Ligand binder design. Structure first.
Ligand SMILES: [Ca+2]
Length: 312
């Protein structure tokens, strides 16, 4: 498999468990520090990074009834400049740029206790697909599906329903949605970290997935595997392969990577394109830092970059 070694430029440092990189509608950049703790207890943070200096500001340090969160992944909304944040302890949060936040669900559409979430991806219809590798949200004791298969997948719909769409995964993490050229969502990709697999489903409609398939294979026998992912504008899927020192690049049809990107660190955790550029920001757990490098083309537009009131 061909490997490229582009120049990685440091963006910011000292972010415990750095991940969930995201850009909002104004081009501002944010990341999450899931591993920040206070007295051995969760006290995860959501930070804004000034790309001009690398300086960090903690805008939100979520806690519900005394239970600190473990913010882990983000997506920016389209109709309002607010962030949807997957939290391993609190479930799904909606965070404002002013730092205030709201907890979205303690239970799903079937009345079952909500599970802690890791990452999410908005499709162009505004539905949010979410991975939930943790067990029940606080106040339940914290559990993770790295050993047992109790990780689930949810779809938080436009009409406000938190629908569990699949279960029994061994730590589902990265997630992405593939769209047809006309904008119709049609494929959901989910990373199952330890099994070194990327799973796919046909998206038939809001919260409707079927045809579950082992779509791709992550290289290596190292501890870890696929974490965060995103599509470039040609629908190639770039996937952080935590523990391999590489970001894998899958073609539109999956299978084995078509190319690999060597990182100057072993644990890439997630990545995100800067709107209107070929720049990919990468979070990593070796140095708990953020970097950026130039990819071959622009990224696939995120939901927040699309227009609700456009003509074309
Ligand atoms: Ca991303």
């Amino acid at each position: 498999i061909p490997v490229i070694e582009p120049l990685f430029t440091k963006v910011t440092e000292d972010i415990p468990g750095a991940q969930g990189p995201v850009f909002d509608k104004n081009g501002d950049f944010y990341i999450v520090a899931p591993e920040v703790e206070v007295n051995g207890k969760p006290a995860g943070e959501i930070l804004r990074i000034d790309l001009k200096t690398g300086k960090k500001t903690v805008i939100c340090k979520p806690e519900v009834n005394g239970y600190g969160g473990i913010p882990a992944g983000c997506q920016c909304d389209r109709d309002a400049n607010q962030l949807f944040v997957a939290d391993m302890r609190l479930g799904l949060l909606v965070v404002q740029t002013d730092g205030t936040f709201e907890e979205i669900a303690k239970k799903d559409s079937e009345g079952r206790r909500m599970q802690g979430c890791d990452d999410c991806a908005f499709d162009y219809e505004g539905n949010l697909w979410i991975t939930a590798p943790a067990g029940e949200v606080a106040p339940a004791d914290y559990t993770r599906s790295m050993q047992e298969k109790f990780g689930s997948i949810y779809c938080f719909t436009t009409d406000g329903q938190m629908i569990q769409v699949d279960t029994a995964f061994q730590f589902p993490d990265g997630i992405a949605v593939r769209h047809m050229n006309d904008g119709r969502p049609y494929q959901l990709i989910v990373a199952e970290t330890p099994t070194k697999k990327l799973w796919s489903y046909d998206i038939k409609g809001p919260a409707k997935i079927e045809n579950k398939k082992v779509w791709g294979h992550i290289p290596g026998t190292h501890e870890g595997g696929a974490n965060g992912m995103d599509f470039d504008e040609d629908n190639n899927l770039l996937v952080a392969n935590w523990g391999s020192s590489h970001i894998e690049v899958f073609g539109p049809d999956g299978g084995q990577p078509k190319m690999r990107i060597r990182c100057p660190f072993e644990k890439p955790s997630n990545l995100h394109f800067k709107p209107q550029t070929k720049t990919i920001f990468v979070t990593e757990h070796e140095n708990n830092a953020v970097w950026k490098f130039e990819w071959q083309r622009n990224g696939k537009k995120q939901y927040c970059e699309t227009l609700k009131f456009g003509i074309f």
